Design a protein around this nucleic acid. Structure first.
Lengths: 322, 321
DNA sequence: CCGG
């Protein structure tokens, strides 16, 4: 019993319920306000398991001790930690999102700052590295998205928790996000796995970015590795400044479906973005353009995909009929 | 053993290929050189694929290989020689040979084309029979060359003939392969599938290239059969006016072949539109009959996503219904 | 007094 995977999963399960309840308190008011300020209702908050870490030292810790859970289990789960005058909660006075497995089991939490006087000055904090929670492989929204990415042959990587919420609410049920860290290799590996039918990868990685420099960072990065999924990788970028949560407030739910639908392939975006910062209106800047982007084509390892982008260069700079 | 082993048999075929290659430069090998040069294959080409000529006579190669030390038991086992009444004799006579190899380049047999008018063998093409090395249902011409580019490019191009593979490779299509003697089956298909995975998780696009249309029909018919997993990744391309890839190169040059490949169609799309091509789209009552023939076909697609993408376009292909 |  003591400290098993199923025991820790039962603790995090108990903790999520407690935090979910705590969202309906008086001191939780600004946590609810954060949600409703960006158009998330009481239905939405319940759908994603949203909760409030209350004030005090050991609200949760005692709650789980009083329903059987020994402290040594709770520290290994990442819920509590050793304080000077005994045990205490990890999370305090913050809006929480339960981070689940694809099976739907809670392994940890993402917590946002609400109050100015909160000692923890970081904007977001997470459950630390545990047996269950692993930063580099865990994803928010994967429980809900699992079915529709396998069916849809499509994943939509977004930055934040509220960005996953806004996408899923707008119909884009394939949206997910990396929790407290950069999107990575074993995140990719996990999503790739679900999109397999037979022994064949099949689908679309759609990376949604906010701010165009953040998109251009992914662009210049696209040519780096073995370019394993590059052919099936795509970029969409919201109207300058915005993110999927904001886009849904200003321009409604349809604007997200279109943003996702009108994604650009990763290499195309990278190349054409470099052409965008050039003068295509003379013979000099036409040559300067090819002089920088033909090398980018040269780096493409798939000869099939390389030849496709070679064909479209003279079109994009201006030297031929598009 | 020492005599009649696998590596010994490969040595016999390797020798045989070297012998037949040399023989292509002979005087009586004029029409065999003519066959190649007539369809735009120069001396550089002929040496790449290892083209050769089987000489006139009875036991030309066999004697040459017996001088090299090979026993008759080995040469018969290799499918190079055979027992005639007054002694051993060659399998091939007075014919342009191409050696057929493994993916690692090891010669396992030959494909021979009829040249002369007074050839004893009536067949247009002859092959090495079933040996320890030569299995007709898994053997493919050009695989040694295409091996790499099929894996990296994630693309194979299946053509009908030897000259079609040659034409494709000279034209820059370095993913072209061909069946030898029999039609393209599952053991060929299942090998290229294995290959295009790239020792990994990759789906590659398999591109069939047909001369006429009965083949395109036969492939269109077979598109919907049983579990149809690799049918989704299969593609078809057909040359205009019923020409093979070799003659498409002769007349319309190397640019046609590369773009024939580029302008290939999905197998399902080809099959559906082939059926639409046999109906009167002029009247509005014809438009409706066409829609009615095709949603049964679209219905037979087992993948939901493909079906939806094919049911989408069905308006456009009917001429707006 | 070959083989196909």
């Amino acid at each position: 019993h003591m400290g098993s995977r199923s025991r820790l999963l039962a603790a995090n399960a108990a903790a999520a319920a407690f935090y979910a309840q705590a969202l309906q308190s008086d001191e939780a008011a600004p946590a609810r306000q954060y949600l409703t300020e960006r158009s998330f209702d009481a239905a939405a908050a319940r759908k994603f398991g949203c909760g409030f870490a209350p004030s005090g030292w050991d609200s949760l810790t005692k709650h789980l001790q009083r329903k059987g859970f020994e402290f040594e289990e709770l520290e290994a789960a990442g819920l509590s930690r050793q304080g000077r005058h005994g045990p205490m909660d990890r999370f305090h006075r913050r809006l929480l999102w339960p981070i689940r497995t694809s099976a739907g089991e809670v392994v940890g939490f993402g917590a946002r700052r609400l109050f100015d006087d909160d000692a923890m000055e970081a904007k977001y904090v997470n459950t630390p590295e545990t047996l269950l929670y692993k930063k580099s492989s865990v994803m928010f929204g994967i429980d809900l998205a699992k079915r529709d990415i396998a069916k849809g042959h499509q994943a939509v990587v977004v930055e934040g928790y509220t960005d996953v919420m806004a996408m899923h609410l707008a119909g884009v049920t394939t949206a997910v996000a990396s929790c407290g860290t950069a999107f990575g290799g074993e995140h990719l590996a996990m999503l790739r796995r679900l999109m397999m039918d037979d022994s064949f990868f099949r689908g679309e990685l759609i990376y949604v970015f906010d701010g165009d420099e953040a998109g251009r960072a992914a662009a210049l990065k696209a040519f780096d590795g073995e370019q394993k999924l590059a052919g099936q990788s795509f970029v969409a970028v919201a109207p300058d400044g915005m993110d999927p949560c904001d886009l849904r407030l200003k321009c409604g739910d349809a604007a997200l479906r279109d943003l996702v639908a009108r994604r650009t392939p990763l290499f195309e975006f990278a190349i054409r973005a470099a052409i965008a910062e050039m003068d295509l209106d003379s013979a000099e800047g036409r040559v300067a353009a090819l002089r920088r982007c033909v090398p980018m084509v040269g780096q493409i390892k798939d000869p099939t995909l390389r030849d496709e982008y070679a064909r479209q260069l003279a079109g994009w700079v201006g030297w031929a009929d598009v």
